Design a protein around this ligand. Structure first.
Ligand SMILES: O=C(O)[C@]1(O)C[C@H](CCCOc2ccccc2)[C@@H](O)[C@H](O)C1
Ligand SMILES: O=C(O)[C@]1(O)C[C@H](CCCOc2ccccc2)[C@@H](O)[C@H](O)C1
Ligand SMILES: O=C(O)[C@]1(O)C[C@H](CCCOc2ccccc2)[C@@H](O)[C@H](O)C1
Ligand SMILES: O=C(O)[C@]1(O)C[C@H](CCCOc2ccccc2)[C@@H](O)[C@H](O)C1
Ligand SMILES: O=C(O)[C@]1(O)C[C@H](CCCOc2ccccc2)[C@@H](O)[C@H](O)C1
Ligand SMILES: O=C(O)[C@]1(O)C[C@H](CCCOc2ccccc2)[C@@H](O)[C@H](O)C1
Ligand SMILES: O=C(O)[C@]1(O)C[C@H](CCCOc2ccccc2)[C@@H](O)[C@H](O)C1
Ligand SMILES: O=C(O)[C@]1(O)C[C@H](CCCOc2ccccc2)[C@@H](O)[C@H](O)C1
Ligand SMILES: O=C(O)[C@]1(O)C[C@H](CCCOc2ccccc2)[C@@H](O)[C@H](O)C1
Ligand SMILES: O=C(O)[C@]1(O)C[C@H](CCCOc2ccccc2)[C@@H](O)[C@H](O)C1
Ligand SMILES: O=C(O)[C@]1(O)C[C@H](CCCOc2ccccc2)[C@@H](O)[C@H](O)C1
Ligand SMILES: O=C(O)[C@]1(O)C[C@H](CCCOc2ccccc2)[C@@H](O)[C@H](O)C1
Lengths: 143, 143, 143, 143, 143, 143, 143, 143, 143, 143, 143, 143
């Protein structure tokens, strides 16, 4: 059985109950539930985790590197800013799928650049919360 | 019933039987078949079309604009170069999902820029041919 | 008698019946009619032609170069992208007036740059469809 | 009856009797006369004014803003340099047509950028003095 | 009664007892006292908090977003670097005043750019510690 | 007794009775009155002056340099354009506070750059007309 | 026997009978003849083809990729603009020699950049029509 | 007899009695005297004039253009900012020598760029007030 | 006796047992041991510490600033990203030696820029783990 | 009889016996021999010279300028760096062919820029040592 | 008695007998003579030297640094390229006057940048050979 | 026994007896002595050489490439300017350590870029003359 780490970065704990015009009306706990529901359908286990702490994100990335498990990562603002987080992600031997809820190319110019994309397997942007469900489906087929 | 236009741009007719290291071993005719198989599973119809001609691509974009049908577009090198094709795509009232087979951010700097992303609903890159199957699944849920 | 070639590039066949907020409510066939009406008033003949095909546009540019006739060209997205079309236009010995319906300077930064302006006699932007009628009036006085 | 303010910026008082290779052989007083002749033909009144003083130009822009009258403005070198003059022009509620006698895109790179274009209704460049007559004709139709 | 959150970012706990040539001789505890003294004079309550932890700053921003209370934020080096902190601040519905003690425009070029200014109500720089007292006075009048 | 020169640059004579959405509903004469009212409260004298003329602004800057009096300067569009005005301001030996009514960082990219900030004591932006009252309060304490 | 594809892009059908000051007085049909004459001397066969159509150029590139035959390509304005054409050329397993008639470095800055050079075996510029004869001689020795 | 116009731009009326560390201890009236003393020695007449007004500078440039007399111009901050003043100077048929008192290349990056240098005969910078005496000596030999 | 703080930033806890091709086969605990062995040889004491937390790094920098002790800092990805960490380091009165294990100039363009180098005493890059031993030897001689 | 100067710049004395993967297995003495063999076939004389000294290269360029003889120049790293060498080459009245052995466009970005190309007759890159033989053949026909 | 070193860099040995349209018809030996004639008039001694060798130029700069004598330096193409030569010049304790014969601002963009200007006392450009005579006159007064 | 080439570029012959504030009070002959003293301690031989001549530096680089011996290179201003010297250094099969005495990142922006760093084993900057002693110690351990 494949175990998949879903990791949300800064501010995404406020999903759904804040800024529904931007990031959608699904809350972080509902997101967790949808991911676990889809994982069961696919015969996988999803571990869904969110933190505002870069140190804490790096630790979760490290652990998935040690376990050789895949990661679906929405790093929030750290996508555009963190070399630390890119270098922890570059270490992963299993696939890394980068997810943005919003279309980061329809926004400010600075969101169009990701430290993560070049070292990710692939990227999904602007498809809302389905982004994560779709990433999980890719990883279920690419084992 | 939703009808979805899958549109491939220049060079992608050579899929699978050329450059399998880059764009994967699935051929364009197999791609068509996989998309039509998945469409049936989802209760949709996919019209899958490829052209090396920008004029011909624009016509297919126009027709989907007139029908208000969604489009999954992998525009190939025109992604990075064509304002004409962006302005035809900007006209679409149904969702437009941009797909790249390869991760265009792990390549030359010029592939990191898309004329299409800012006017697309969303973007999927680097997930190979599954990219298209995943886009089709989003569009099946977002009706 | 002066003969004037009016040449519309990609997407402008959809004028008026699409995107009236941007490019105005005059359709391409009405545009043709207004140009031919104004040409008669001025004692000229206008040949009004539109194509989504760069190859086809180049051929029409070539023919006007061979006839030494003037051209009013709205190249659409190719304004910002095509060196091919600029080099065919650079060949014209009679005047070349560049026309944009929309004000391309009140839009995305990329529309502010034209390959054509430097080799054109002159440029008219943002005055809608009158742009073309005004270009025709200049060419009637500059013979 | 429409009243139209034609406003010339620095150095354009020297028109025609200087630099005829660049800006044409029509003098500023002849320019005035041609504009007033064309205005009568169109059933409008043109007030044609030139100043080397940015303060004086701003005052003339202010007055047209207060009267809600249109403006045809050739700001000369201030086109490329003045945010003050752009912000006075941005205030106009009637149309603002930017005019350059010369084709500013066939010259030094710095002339290709205008502070005024983004806030103008439209722009006419390189059509010489007819530029102004054509702008007046647009404003006569867009009332 | 208005409650105002004053939030200091990395390194500003060392105020006054370090680098008095740059950031002034007022210490962080004296800063707190001056802010609370001025708040009483104005009939408001100030909650003054400092942290070297971006995670901790984000939490304090979140809480003010939930309470709809205003914030005076001096984010220190994170002003120039953090998209995470900008996106938490963008969420605030009450006013956000950005404060720098030093004039960040008289220093290295990189300090001249703030992620925060575009989403702030306003900015006060280079007026030392009075910066904060002045921000508090604005917020007292803008309720 | 401290005397403070408040100097407004181009277009700001139109305050309040124009563009109230941008620069607020306070007129220039009301601005004067509010500044003189606050000056009395603070035991200072404010000399409040506005001009559309760069030459006239430079003269007022010169006079304050000769008197060694402080200046609150909102230079309008000249903030982003004038080296002349910066070099006159650099001469001031008493404090210079730069004021913008609007938040110039939430607007076009060109307004984010000031010739004045690097040579000013400090800057206040986006706090509307209170900007000036707050600058006056700083200068009252920094004597 | 080596077969070599000589491929000319947009506008080069007008060679010699147009713009002899820039591209020389040899016409496209004479070019063909000179290339076939030189090929016989070298014991090779040259297939010389020109098109204004990017789609048509891509097809000719595809065919040479399938045959593993070399290509001498002068892509005209598409040299500086087309990623599509670069990606078809990148596929060639036999040598690709890029040819410009004119010295593209003695012209506008934009002609100094080629999408093709990085994926070509080599480049020959500014040696006029001999460019092609020289490329053919290289390919005759590098088999 | 040669007549030479020496023209000083904004802020240079304050020479010598202000900022002697930067621009030297010679006052504007002493500068005038030194220039007239040197002119007599050389058998020329110098007309030495200073203005803070761009309009006034343009008028003095115009007059020298009409008289075909040479100009020594220190435009102050307008050197780096004014296209208006460059275009009036470009009109001069006699030599134009650009003078800076200070070495503008040992200062802020923005002072290293002059609108005037490209259209001047020559430039003298950083040699203080002798700059002007040396320019006058060149013009005495180049008649 | 000199006390030297050796401080490792994000991801460097994984040294040696991960990515030995990049950062070498020495683990973080072996690194500690080698540094303490060399310190004894030199008559110094090394305090060797690693953290993934920017807040924690800043605290360790603060403490060395308060003790006026030197620091050898390998900040990992924060080298290229953190102004916070630069400003804490700028405070150090004893020497600061920046160390990179890898040669950061033989890698991606973004690693070639350090916030730390300009405020460091000196920099050592690409000499692997010896980097640290060499920095310690410099600090032993520069007391 | 035409005399042709073949001039090799820094490091190219090491040809063939060093870095055969990059610059090919032909040594500098073999290069000389091949060039002299081809010159005899063509009825010309080649003078083949190499130097690591820019001063020495300039002297050889000077001599060919004085003799009005053509030059084939591979300047090595000086191609991308030397304005001195460009200005000596600009003086040549006979043709100058720039040669690179390697394709300088398939390498680091800095090799893509040549000081020499704009003033050369033409350029040949990436065709190895044949580059020189081909340049000699052009010069034999262009006399 | 003041001794002044006049130092000419690469290519300037060819003065006057080459490129008289650019650098004037005075030869290097005549230049020497004019400088020595003017030096006698001024009561100074000029040592006039030219070299194509950067090493040789550096030695002459070194010697003037050791003697604390002034230098008039026209470095030719090395002006725009050499940090070595700038750092030798930065060492001079007596004045350094940079001279260009041609106006380097009316030419290619790359000539507008000098490594030398920022460390020179002053710069004289475009005044031909008089440049040197004028520099000598400054140095005679500034002792 | 390891032989190590220590190579100093332009201006560094003047070490210690010039510019002691920048490059330290150790002279070039003392530098030699310290390096030879340290080499004996380490059981190596150092050959220490300095030249102002790029040609001479290239020859010394060539010889070390032929001997497969390591090099410690401080190239002076050529660090930032010379592609020739980089390409000779790229040839070295033994380690190349780049040394700067000064911290080149605390200086002008242009010194922050090295042609050498990307092809060096490693870099040591700002540690003064110890830089060289430390490089020698690395090379003694990395054999
Ligand atoms: O589109 C996305 O998922 C992002 O990665 C999310 C971010 C999210 C910021 C989080 O802010 C929130 C605030 C309230 C509710 C949800 C998210 C942003 O920093 C990236 O540019 C785009
Ligand atoms: O990754 C993708 O799908 C692309 O959009 C595809 C392109 C495809 C070029 C097509 O070339 C092929 C050649 C042989 C076989 C398949 C594709 C390229 O121009 C884009 O940068 C990335
Ligand atoms: O303003 C103009 O006329 C343009 O040249 C027109 C374009 C037109 C695109 C055509 O799109 C249309 C779609 C529907 C209806 C009419 C036009 C655009 O690509 C240029 O930037 C500006
Ligand atoms: O092309 C135009 O009308 C301009 O706006 C006019 C300008 C005119 C400068 C005026 O100079 C003159 C000098 C003598 C005679 C007429 C004009 C220039 O600064 C703009 O770039 C282009
Ligand atoms: O001027 C300000 O208040 C800043 O926002 C403060 C910062 C403060 C850094 C904190 O460093 C300190 C060190 C010792 C004492 C006080 C502050 C800096 O990173 C910003 O560019 C400007
Ligand atoms: O925000 C400010 O105070 C400004 O300095 C004001 C300006 C004001 C322009 C004046 O325009 C007005 C027009 C009507 C009413 C008030 C002001 C603008 O040029 C600066 O970018 C920002
Ligand atoms: O120098 C060359 O061969 C070019 O590749 C040719 C082009 C040719 C354009 C074709 O235009 C012609 C027009 C009339 C006659 C011949 C060519 C141009 O777009 C490239 O920058 C340089
Ligand atoms: O170096 C020069 O002469 C300048 O052209 C003079 C200027 C002068 C500004 C005038 O300011 C003064 C203030 C007091 C006394 C004298 C001059 C400056 O704007 C240019 O960058 C350099
Ligand atoms: O070369 C170095 O020491 C670095 O400062 C280290 C970094 C280290 C990232 C840490 O990643 C590691 C992962 C596994 C094992 C060791 C390090 C990187 O972010 C800098 O660009 C260069
Ligand atoms: O491709 C070429 O011929 C070059 O002009 C040659 C150079 C040659 C450097 C010489 O290095 C060598 C080292 C060993 C053997 C041969 C050459 C390089 O600096 C240019 O970028 C490209
Ligand atoms: O204008 C000047 O004096 C220069 O410093 C001279 C140079 C001179 C190059 C020398 O070339 C010559 C060739 C023949 C005759 C005289 C000079 C050039 O590299 C600088 O950009 C401008
Ligand atoms: O810091 C270093 O060692 C340098 O590589 C040395 C240089 C040295 C220039 C030599 O100048 C000197 C002058 C007098 C005494 C010693 C050195 C400079 O060009 C580099 O940017 C930094």
């Amino acid at each position: 059985e494949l175990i998949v780490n879903v990791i949300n970065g800064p501010n995404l704990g406020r999903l759904g109950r804040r800024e529904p015009a931007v990031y959608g009306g699904t809350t972080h706990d509902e997101l967790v539930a949808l991911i676990e529901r889809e994982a069961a359908e696919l015969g996988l286990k999803a571990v869904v985790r969110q933190s505002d702490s870069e140190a804490q994100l790096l630790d979760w990335i490290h652990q998935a590197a040690d376990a050789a498990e895949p990661v679906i990562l929405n790093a929030g603002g750290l996508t555009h800013t963190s070399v630390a987080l890119r270098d922890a992600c570059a270490e992963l031997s299993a696939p890394l799928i980068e997810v943005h809820i919003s279309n980061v190319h329809a926004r400010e110019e600075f969101r169009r650049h990701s430290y993560l994309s070049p070292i990710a397997t692939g990227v999904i942007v602007g498809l809302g919360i389905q982004g994560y469900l779709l990433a999980l489906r890719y990883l279920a087929e690419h084992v």
